[PDB]
Amino acid sequence: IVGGHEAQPHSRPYMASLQMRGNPGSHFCGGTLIHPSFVLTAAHCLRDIPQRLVNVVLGAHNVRTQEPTQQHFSVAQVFLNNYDAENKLNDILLIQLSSPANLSASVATVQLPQQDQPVPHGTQCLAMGWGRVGAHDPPAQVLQELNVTVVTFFCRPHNICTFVPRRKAGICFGDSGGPLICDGIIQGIDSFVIWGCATRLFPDFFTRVALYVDWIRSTLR
Amino acid sequence: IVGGHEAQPHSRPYMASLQMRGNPGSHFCGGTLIHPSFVLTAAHCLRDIPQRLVNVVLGAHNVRTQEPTQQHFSVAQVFLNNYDAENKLNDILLIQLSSPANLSASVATVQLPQQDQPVPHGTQCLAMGWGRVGAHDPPAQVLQELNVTVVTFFCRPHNICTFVPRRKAGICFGDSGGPLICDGIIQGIDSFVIWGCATRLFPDFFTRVALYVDWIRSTLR
Amino acid sequence: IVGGHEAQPHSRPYMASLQMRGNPGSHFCGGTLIHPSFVLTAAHCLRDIPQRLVNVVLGAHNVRTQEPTQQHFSVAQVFLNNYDAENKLNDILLIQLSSPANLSASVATVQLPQQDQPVPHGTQCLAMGWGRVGAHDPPAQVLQELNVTVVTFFCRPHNICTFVPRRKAGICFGDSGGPLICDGIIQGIDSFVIWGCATRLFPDFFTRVALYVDWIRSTLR
Amino acid sequence: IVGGHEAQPHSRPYMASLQMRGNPGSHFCGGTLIHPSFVLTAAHCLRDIPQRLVNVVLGAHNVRTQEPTQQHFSVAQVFLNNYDAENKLNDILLIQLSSPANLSASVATVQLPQQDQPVPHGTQCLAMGWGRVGAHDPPAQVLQELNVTVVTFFCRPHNICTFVPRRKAGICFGDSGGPLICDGIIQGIDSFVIWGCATRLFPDFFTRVALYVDWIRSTLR
Ligand SMILES: *[C@@H]1O[C@H](CO[C@@H]2O[C@@H](C)[C@@H](O)[C@@H](O)[C@@H]2O)[C@@H](O)[C@H](O)[C@H]1NC(C)=O
Ligand SMILES: *[C@@H]1O[C@H](CO[C@@H]2O[C@@H](C)[C@@H](O)[C@@H](O)[C@@H]2O)[C@@H](O)[C@H](O)[C@H]1NC(C)=O
Ligand SMILES: *[C@@H]1O[C@H](CO[C@@H]2O[C@@H](C)[C@@H](O)[C@@H](O)[C@@H]2O)[C@@H](O)[C@H](O)[C@H]1NC(C)=O
Ligand SMILES: *[C@@H]1O[C@H](CO[C@@H]2O[C@@H](C)[C@@H](O)[C@@H](O)[C@@H]2O)[C@@H](O)[C@H](O)[C@H]1NC(C)=O
């Protein structure tokens, strides 16, 4: 997250760090705990990488630290919904944890939107993540969050776009798969930026979760 | 103006219509009365037209008629400031009328902003003109106006960009030179569009008047 | 024509200069004599301007001067093939002169291609016209010509694109309606530029004449 | 490489495969052996990863396999030349191998350009790599090659751009750091693509090797 700020530690307990097994703090994407056993993330995060190498780390703040709150899981399975990499469509992935998370103080779930639920232009949401804090600066130890506004410009109905007009801010690399929080509900998943991070020229793109509620529910059976 | 609405007759008494001398109703550009003997417009409106052929019409609503409210002037002198046509910078030109306007109801001046005064993203403005009301039928007989919002997306600081979020709307051919009125002050001048009118993807560009306030005033003295 | 060079006088006898009647030298668009009574041009050239005020000048070289070689015609009739000004499609118009030109060394026709005849990438053509020589010097007096090559980049099959790979060159304002001749056949009509003239970043766009050949021939009755 | 073809085995012996140390066939970037101890790559290849985890494989063809031609190296040091991740500038990195390669039949160096040496629009080159070869097809097993043409359209001088005129083809993910070979000389390094691979809209961008010729020389010795 570029130009956002440090979240209160564990203030967003549904936050998941996707890392590589055996290399702690090797965060490469965010995810969102939607069920004790399912992390919701971006389909693009899981490409370039075999499942077995994946490590879902829950209840963290500082991912490159051995927090007592941290809980680790490996991937039992993953489900996709016609992800189009060329068009950057359906960039959504449900990861089934090896084991169910222990829903504690620093580890919680979040509500899904209603199927086809709208997020209007002007909606203020929170975007968070451990991603790059500026395209030329070493990653973020601590979870960062950023208030953004849903915009319709330079956007596709497929996605939800956000923008920070006032300042140089937005999602960056590492933020992929993270959640976009609007009124306590996850409305988006970090999908893509254009050209770069915080260009101040285009919105940041998020997968529109409401499109896939029915699928997610049926997938959780 | 695309997707705009007709202004109330003479509600915008500072609206000037640049016409071709000897051809009544030959509106090609808009302009703004800011001093009884000076019209402000875009440098680009007088690229391919010699000074002497310019007829500045004040007091209009329906420019395709000789309204009693009108007052016509020829051009005395024109002033510019480092206009760059390839980069589309400093698209500003001051036309000193052949004679002072006689301020009445239908003809009146507008105030200039202060030098380097800012116009933030989200600032609600008004655009107006007699440009094409679309690329599907002729330009506007009567003055059209459009409520727009200043945006900074896909924009450049030198310019003020606007955009109308919901619908197919924006400035078009013939609106070039007219004012961008924000809080009853002129903050911009219709300078350029990208590709076409009301692309719904690109914002409309305007010269940022606050940059040239000192030059303008200095010239008016 | 930016970065072009002056043509040898009357070495392109099918070059038409479109002007405002009564106002000599007022070249505003190009044309191409393809028949004694027919000038082929871009539909956008006569968008605003009424037919009555247009003056078709043939036999010119320096359009800004009276030349014994020139022949003026008025617009008898104009033909359109479904011009889409927003998509910039079918930018072609047939102007029927009020009287047949008198073909000479200085005034001759140019042949059309066959319907759907391709013009492959790499194809070397000539573009010419009296348009702006760069938006820095006031418009071409004498005919300017430029060596260009057809390209498929950043293009549309509906159009024919050209680019001058090694120099800041290209068609400019005033060249619209002019011819793109390849192998002494007219293959395009100067239709539009992207951003401005000679961007060195976008190919110039031309109406693909081979697309409207039957319509054309038939219109010639 | 998208729409490219399989290079003949060991026909491009200066090709390097940057992989994750301890992860056999974990190819993430290309490189070019320009000296027995130095591999040429893109600076963005070693952004995410730390150098103590980088495995530099020579003499390869199928990267997934344990081939008898492969020589594996470790990163001894790295060199940068003012890399700009914001603007994607100076995307060049010199890697010092822990040990010199044994210049054999399947492992050889490639010649460098002269400093400031031009590569004109129209120059035909070879781009090769083991990157993704199709958005839903994995990354290449075996070395892929593609003839591409150097273009100046939609480009900047800092970069060398290329395009394959009429075919969905070009570089792709995992092609980064690889070389652009023209007339048997390395002229570019795969830097970036715009939006995606083989959009057929934008050129692929390569680091312009000749700008850094002098820096690579002194750094080598
Ligand atoms: C920034 O957002 C803060 C939290 O946002 C609210 O809670 C998050 C989780 C979302 O559900 C979001 O939709 C809500 O607005 C707010 O307390 C705060 O008002 C915002 N900050 C400012 C100064 O804009
Ligand atoms: C549209 O704008 C109307 C007028 O705008 C106000 O006055 C103009 C001249 C400007 O100075 C502008 O900055 C002001 O907002 C408003 O009465 C109206 O609220 C706006 N309409 C809507 C429905 O958005
Ligand atoms: C430029 O082109 C000259 C003329 O081009 C040819 O003739 C014109 C009328 C067209 O029909 C065109 O398609 C033909 O290519 C050539 O004689 C000349 O050598 C060319 N010069 C360079 C420097 O390219
Ligand atoms: C594609 O390129 C093949 C080899 O390219 C030539 O040598 C390489 C190593 C480069 O240095 C390049 O500049 C040279 O052109 C050719 O054998 C093949 O003919 C090429 N294809 C085409 C369409 O000509």
Swiss-Prot record, chains A, B, C, D:
Disulfide links within the chain: 29-45, 125-182, 155-161, 172-197
Subcellular location: Cytoplasmic granule; Secreted; Cell membrane; Membrane raft
Active-site feature positions: 44 (charge relay system), 91 (charge relay system), 176 (charge relay system)
Membrane topology: Peripheral membrane protein
Tissue: Expressed in polymorphonuclear leukocytes (at protein level). Expressed in neutrophils (at protein level). Expressed in differentiating neutrophils.
GO cellular component terms listed in the entry, alphabetical order: azurophil granule lumen; cytosol; extracellular exosome; extracellular region; extracellular space; intracellular membrane-bounded organelle; plasma membrane; plasma membrane raft
Keywords: Cell membrane, Collagen degradation, Disulfide bond, Glycoprotein, Hydrolase, Membrane, Protease, Secreted, Serine protease, Signal, Zymogen
Domain of life: Eukaryota
Pfam families tied to this protein: Trypsin
Major localisation: cytoplasm
GO molecular function: enzyme binding; serine-type endopeptidase activity; serine-type peptidase activity; signaling receptor binding
Regulation: Inhibited by phenylmethanesulfonyl fluoride (PMSF) and diisopropyl fluorophosphate (DFP).
Matches recorded under CDD domains: Tryp_SPc
Assembly description: May form dimers. Interacts with CD177; the interaction tethers PRTN3 to the cell surface; the interaction is direct. Interacts with SERPINB1. Interacts with ADGRG3.
Family that this chain belongs to: Belongs to the peptidase S1 family. Elastase subfamily.
Entry's disease: Is the major autoantigen in anti-neutrophil cytoplasmic autoantibody (ANCA)-associated vasculitis (Wegener's granulomatosis). This complex, systemic disease is characterized by granulomatous inflammation with necrotizing lesions in the respiratory tract, glomerulonephritis, vasculitis, and anti-neutrophil cytoplasmic autoantibodies detected in patient sera. PRTN3 causes emphysema when administered by tracheal insufflation to hamsters.
Function, in words: Serine protease that degrades elastin, fibronectin, laminin, vitronectin, and collagen types I, III, and IV (in vitro). By cleaving and activating receptor F2RL1/PAR-2, enhances endothelial cell barrier function and thus vascular integrity during neutrophil transendothelial migration. Plays a role in neutrophil transendothelial migration, probably when associated with CD177. Triggers inflammatory processes in neutrophils by interacting with ADGRG3 upstream of F2RL1/PAR2 activation.
Protein's name in the database: Myeloblastin
Species in which this protein is naturally found: Homo sapiens (Human)
